[PDB]
């Protein structure tokens, strides 16, 4: 009856492959998010440092 | 007569000068106050100009921090889903291992016994074949 | 006297015209001065209003920075939780590899040569059956 245990393992391995793929999607979404955060941070720093060089 | 008429008119002159001189002093003092105010108005216009620019850039900074909070909230929720995902992953590994442990349970020390019995009997049959080859 | 009287009459008309122009001078300058004062007051009030608007904009910026800090702390905590779970997964994957290799050692039921032994027994029984035949 070991073949039964095998089809159970195959079922759970399908599920974990799916979760890994969802995981890599989510990581791509964090890479996106961090790129927007860097963009926003640099825009802020540039406005500041333009005003700074202007005041000199 | 004419003598007193002249003295009346001479006075009227003195009085008219006194009026006009007083007025002249009012006017040029008033011109002072107007120029000082023109300069002040200019200073105020310039402060308002600078202050409107500071306002514009601080509004820009404010839009940028509002956007960063939106994006950082996105990051927080993504990390949450990452965690939930990884926790499912661990549950699945732990199920897989329960099945792998039950698979291992399937073991048989009874098949070696038939192996040895069969082996000896095959070679007992070989013994019989040697003795029948002999004749 | 005859000519001096007429001198004085002309001087009178001239000085009076001078003073009338000077008076309109004054009243016009005073009006314009008042208009300048009201513009000036209006600008001063505006400058207070904008300085207040600036202070509140600065406070808005301070409060937004604090809130970004709070979300950053939360991010860092979540990052560590992800790292811990990743280590947990690494250790589970190793254990599962060890169990799977144990199965492969066990899985190799080459003991199924039972069939080899049996088939050889009936081939050899055939052999001595044919040889008892001869």
Coordinates of C-alpha atoms in Angstrom, one line a residue:
Chain A
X1 CA 0.0 0.0 0.0
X2 CA 3.1 2.2 -0.4
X3 CA 1.9 3.6 -3.7
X4 CA -0.8 5.4 -1.7
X5 CA 1.9 7.1 0.4
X6 CA 3.5 8.1 -2.9
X7 CA 0.5 9.8 -4.4
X8 CA 0.1 11.6 -1.1
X9 CA 3.8 12.8 -1.4
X10 CA 3.1 13.8 -5.0
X11 CA 0.1 15.8 -4.0
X12 CA 2.0 17.7 -1.2
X13 CA 4.9 18.3 -3.6
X14 CA 2.6 19.9 -6.2
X15 CA 1.4 22.2 -3.4
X16 CA 4.9 23.2 -2.2
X17 CA 6.1 23.9 -5.8
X18 CA 3.1 26.2 -6.1
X19 CA 4.0 28.0 -2.9
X20 CA 7.6 28.4 -4.1
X21 CA 6.3 30.0 -7.3
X22 CA 4.0 32.4 -5.3
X23 CA 7.0 33.2 -3.1
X24 CA 9.2 34.2 -6.1
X25 CA 6.3 36.4 -7.4
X26 CA 6.1 38.1 -4.0
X27 CA 9.8 38.7 -3.9
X28 CA 9.6 40.4 -7.3
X29 CA 6.9 42.6 -5.8
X30 CA 9.2 43.6 -3.0
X31 CA 12.0 44.4 -5.5
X32 CA 9.5 46.7 -7.2
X33 CA 8.5 48.3 -3.9
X34 CA 12.1 48.9 -2.9
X35 CA 12.8 50.5 -6.2
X36 CA 9.9 53.0 -5.7
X37 CA 11.2 53.7 -2.2
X38 CA 14.6 54.5 -3.5
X39 CA 13.1 56.7 -6.2
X40 CA 11.0 58.6 -3.6
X41 CA 14.1 58.9 -1.3
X42 CA 16.3 60.3 -4.0
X43 CA 13.6 62.8 -5.2
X44 CA 13.4 64.1 -1.6
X45 CA 17.2 64.3 -1.3
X46 CA 17.5 66.1 -4.6
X47 CA 14.9 68.8 -3.8
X48 CA 16.8 69.4 -0.5
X49 CA 20.2 69.6 -2.0
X50 CA 19.0 71.9 -4.8
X51 CA 17.7 74.3 -2.2
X52 CA 21.0 73.8 -0.4
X53 CA 23.2 74.7 -3.3
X54 CA 20.8 77.6 -4.1
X55 CA 21.3 79.1 -0.6
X56 CA 25.1 79.2 -1.2
Chain B
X1 CA -4.5 155.9 4.5
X2 CA -2.8 154.3 1.5
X3 CA -0.1 153.9 4.2
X4 CA -2.4 151.7 6.3
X5 CA -3.7 149.9 3.2
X6 CA -0.2 149.0 2.3
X7 CA 0.4 147.7 5.9
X8 CA -2.7 145.5 5.7
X9 CA -1.6 144.1 2.3
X10 CA 1.9 143.5 3.6
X11 CA 0.4 141.5 6.5
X12 CA -1.8 139.5 4.1
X13 CA 1.4 138.6 2.3
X14 CA 3.2 137.5 5.5
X15 CA 0.2 135.3 6.3
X16 CA 0.1 133.8 2.9
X17 CA 3.8 132.9 3.0
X18 CA 3.3 131.3 6.5
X19 CA 0.5 129.2 5.1
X20 CA 2.4 128.2 2.0
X21 CA 5.6 127.4 3.8
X22 CA 3.7 125.2 6.3
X23 CA 2.0 123.4 3.4
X24 CA 5.3 122.9 1.6
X25 CA 6.7 121.2 4.7
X26 CA 3.6 119.0 5.0
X27 CA 4.2 117.9 1.3
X28 CA 7.8 117.0 1.5
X29 CA 7.3 115.2 4.8
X30 CA 4.5 113.3 3.1
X31 CA 6.8 112.5 0.3
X32 CA 9.2 111.0 2.9
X33 CA 6.5 108.8 4.4
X34 CA 5.4 107.6 0.9
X35 CA 8.9 106.5 -0.1
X36 CA 9.6 104.7 3.2
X37 CA 6.3 102.8 2.6
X38 CA 7.1 102.1 -1.0
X39 CA 10.4 100.4 0.3
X40 CA 8.5 98.6 3.0
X41 CA 5.9 97.3 0.6
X42 CA 8.7 96.1 -1.6
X43 CA 10.3 94.2 1.3
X44 CA 7.0 92.6 2.1
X45 CA 6.3 91.5 -1.5
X46 CA 9.7 89.9 -1.5
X47 CA 9.2 88.0 1.8
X48 CA 5.8 86.7 0.5
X49 CA 7.5 85.6 -2.8
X50 CA 10.2 83.7 -0.9
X51 CA 7.7 82.2 1.5
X52 CA 5.4 81.0 -1.4
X53 CA 8.4 79.1 -2.8
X54 CA 9.2 77.5 0.5
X55 CA 5.6 76.5 0.6
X56 CA 5.7 74.9 -2.8
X57 CA 8.8 72.8 -2.0
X58 CA 7.5 71.8 1.4
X59 CA 4.2 70.7 -0.3
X60 CA 6.4 68.6 -2.6
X61 CA 8.2 67.0 0.3
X62 CA 4.8 66.3 1.8
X63 CA 3.5 64.6 -1.3
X64 CA 6.7 62.5 -1.4
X65 CA 6.4 61.3 2.2
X66 CA 2.7 60.5 1.7
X67 CA 3.7 58.3 -1.3
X68 CA 6.4 56.6 0.7
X69 CA 3.9 55.7 3.4
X70 CA 1.7 54.2 0.7
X71 CA 4.7 52.2 -0.7
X72 CA 6.0 51.2 2.7
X73 CA 2.5 49.9 3.6
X74 CA 2.7 47.8 0.4
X75 CA 6.1 46.5 1.6
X76 CA 4.7 45.6 5.0
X77 CA 1.8 43.6 3.6
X78 CA 4.0 41.9 1.1
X79 CA 6.3 40.7 3.9
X80 CA 3.2 39.5 5.7
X81 CA 2.2 37.3 2.7
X82 CA 5.8 36.1 2.4
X83 CA 5.6 35.0 6.0
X84 CA 2.3 33.2 5.5
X85 CA 3.7 31.5 2.4
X86 CA 6.8 30.3 4.2
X87 CA 4.7 29.0 7.1
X88 CA 2.6 26.9 4.6
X89 CA 5.9 25.7 3.2
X90 CA 6.9 24.4 6.6
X91 CA 3.6 22.7 7.2
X92 CA 3.9 21.0 3.8
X93 CA 7.4 19.8 4.5
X94 CA 6.2 18.4 7.8
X95 CA 3.4 16.6 6.1
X96 CA 5.8 15.2 3.5
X97 CA 8.0 13.9 6.3
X98 CA 5.1 12.2 8.1
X99 CA 4.4 10.3 4.9
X100 CA 8.2 9.6 4.5
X101 CA 8.3 8.1 8.0
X102 CA 5.3 5.9 7.3
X103 CA 6.9 4.7 4.1
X104 CA 9.9 3.6 6.1
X105 CA 7.7 1.7 8.5
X106 CA 7.1 -0.7 5.6
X107 CA 9.9 -3.3 6.1
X108 CA 10.1 -7.1 6.0
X109 CA 12.5 -9.5 7.7
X110 CA 10.4 -12.4 6.6
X111 CA 11.6 -12.3 3.0
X112 CA 15.2 -13.3 3.9
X113 CA 13.8 -16.5 5.4
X114 CA 12.3 -17.7 2.1
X115 CA 15.5 -16.6 0.4
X116 CA 17.6 -18.9 2.4
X117 CA 15.2 -21.9 2.3
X118 CA 14.9 -21.5 -1.5
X119 CA 18.6 -21.2 -1.8
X120 CA 19.4 -24.4 0.1
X121 CA 16.8 -26.3 -1.9
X122 CA 18.1 -25.1 -5.2
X123 CA 21.5 -26.4 -4.2
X124 CA 20.0 -29.6 -2.8
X125 CA 18.5 -30.0 -6.3
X126 CA 22.0 -29.4 -7.7
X127 CA 23.3 -32.2 -5.4
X128 CA 20.6 -34.5 -6.8
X129 CA 21.6 -33.5 -10.4
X130 CA 25.3 -34.3 -9.7
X131 CA 24.4 -37.7 -8.3
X132 CA 22.2 -38.4 -11.4
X133 CA 24.9 -37.1 -13.7
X134 CA 27.3 -39.6 -12.1
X135 CA 25.7 -42.6 -13.8
Chain C
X1 CA 2.7 153.8 -3.3
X2 CA 0.9 153.8 -6.7
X3 CA 3.1 151.0 -8.1
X4 CA 3.9 149.2 -4.8
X5 CA 0.2 148.6 -4.2
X6 CA 0.0 146.7 -7.5
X7 CA 3.1 144.7 -6.6
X8 CA 1.4 143.5 -3.4
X9 CA -1.8 142.7 -5.3
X10 CA 0.0 140.4 -7.7
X11 CA 2.0 138.7 -4.9
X12 CA -1.3 138.0 -3.1
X13 CA -2.9 136.3 -6.1
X14 CA 0.2 134.3 -6.7
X15 CA 0.7 133.1 -3.1
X16 CA -3.0 132.1 -2.8
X17 CA -2.8 130.0 -6.0
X18 CA 0.4 128.4 -4.7
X19 CA -1.3 127.5 -1.4
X20 CA -4.3 126.0 -3.1
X21 CA -2.2 123.8 -5.3
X22 CA -0.1 122.9 -2.2
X23 CA -3.3 121.9 -0.3
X24 CA -4.5 119.6 -3.1
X25 CA -0.9 118.2 -3.1
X26 CA -1.3 117.3 0.6
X27 CA -4.8 115.8 0.5
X28 CA -3.8 113.6 -2.5
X29 CA -0.6 112.5 -0.8
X30 CA -2.6 111.6 2.3
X31 CA -5.0 109.5 0.4
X32 CA -2.2 107.7 -1.4
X33 CA -0.5 107.2 1.9
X34 CA -3.6 105.6 3.4
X35 CA -3.9 103.2 0.4
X36 CA -0.2 102.3 1.0
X37 CA -0.9 101.6 4.7
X38 CA -3.9 99.3 3.9
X39 CA -1.8 97.4 1.3
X40 CA 1.0 97.2 3.9
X41 CA -1.4 95.9 6.6
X42 CA -2.9 93.4 4.2
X43 CA 0.7 92.1 3.3
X44 CA 1.6 91.9 7.0
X45 CA -1.5 89.8 7.8
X46 CA -0.7 87.6 4.8
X47 CA 2.9 87.1 6.1
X48 CA 1.6 85.9 9.4
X49 CA -0.9 83.6 7.7
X50 CA 1.8 82.1 5.5
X51 CA 4.2 81.8 8.4
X52 CA 1.5 79.8 10.3
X53 CA 0.9 77.7 7.2
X54 CA 4.7 77.1 7.0
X55 CA 4.8 76.0 10.7
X56 CA 2.0 73.5 10.2
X57 CA 3.6 72.2 7.0
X58 CA 6.8 71.6 9.0
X59 CA 4.8 69.7 11.6
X60 CA 3.1 67.6 8.9
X61 CA 6.6 66.7 7.7
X62 CA 7.8 65.8 11.2
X63 CA 4.8 63.6 11.8
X64 CA 5.1 61.9 8.4
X65 CA 8.8 61.0 9.2
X66 CA 7.8 59.5 12.5
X67 CA 5.2 57.3 10.8
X68 CA 7.7 56.1 8.2
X69 CA 10.0 55.2 11.1
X70 CA 7.2 53.1 12.7
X71 CA 6.6 51.3 9.5
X72 CA 10.4 50.7 9.1
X73 CA 10.6 49.1 12.5
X74 CA 7.7 46.8 11.6
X75 CA 9.5 46.0 8.3
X76 CA 12.6 45.0 10.1
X77 CA 10.8 42.7 12.5
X78 CA 9.1 41.0 9.6
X79 CA 12.4 40.7 7.8
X80 CA 13.9 38.8 10.8
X81 CA 10.8 36.5 11.0
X82 CA 11.3 35.7 7.3
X83 CA 15.0 34.9 7.9
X84 CA 14.2 32.6 10.9
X85 CA 11.6 30.7 8.8
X86 CA 14.1 30.4 5.9
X87 CA 16.6 28.7 8.3
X88 CA 13.8 26.4 9.6
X89 CA 13.1 25.5 6.0
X90 CA 16.7 24.8 5.3
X91 CA 16.9 22.4 8.2
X92 CA 13.6 20.6 7.2
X93 CA 14.8 20.2 3.7
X94 CA 18.0 18.6 4.9
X95 CA 16.1 16.1 7.2
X96 CA 13.7 15.3 4.3
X97 CA 16.7 14.6 2.1
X98 CA 18.1 12.2 4.7
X99 CA 14.7 10.4 5.0
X100 CA 14.4 10.2 1.2
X101 CA 17.9 8.7 0.9
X102 CA 17.1 6.2 3.6
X103 CA 14.0 5.2 1.6
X104 CA 16.1 4.7 -1.5
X105 CA 18.4 2.4 0.5
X106 CA 15.3 0.6 1.7
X107 CA 13.4 1.0 -1.6
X108 CA 15.9 -1.2 -3.2
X109 CA 14.1 -4.4 -2.6
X110 CA 16.4 -6.5 -4.8
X111 CA 15.1 -9.3 -2.7
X112 CA 12.6 -9.8 -5.6
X113 CA 15.1 -12.3 -7.0
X114 CA 12.8 -14.6 -5.2
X115 CA 11.5 -15.1 -8.7
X116 CA 15.1 -15.8 -9.9
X117 CA 15.4 -18.6 -7.3
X118 CA 11.9 -20.0 -8.2
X119 CA 12.4 -20.0 -12.0
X120 CA 15.8 -21.6 -11.5
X121 CA 14.2 -24.3 -9.4
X122 CA 11.7 -25.2 -12.2
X123 CA 14.4 -25.1 -14.8
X124 CA 16.6 -27.5 -12.8
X125 CA 13.6 -29.7 -12.0
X126 CA 13.0 -29.8 -15.7
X127 CA 16.6 -30.8 -16.2
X128 CA 16.5 -33.8 -13.9
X129 CA 13.1 -34.8 -15.2
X130 CA 14.5 -35.0 -18.7
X131 CA 17.6 -36.9 -17.3
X132 CA 15.5 -39.4 -15.4
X133 CA 13.8 -39.7 -18.8
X134 CA 17.1 -40.8 -20.3

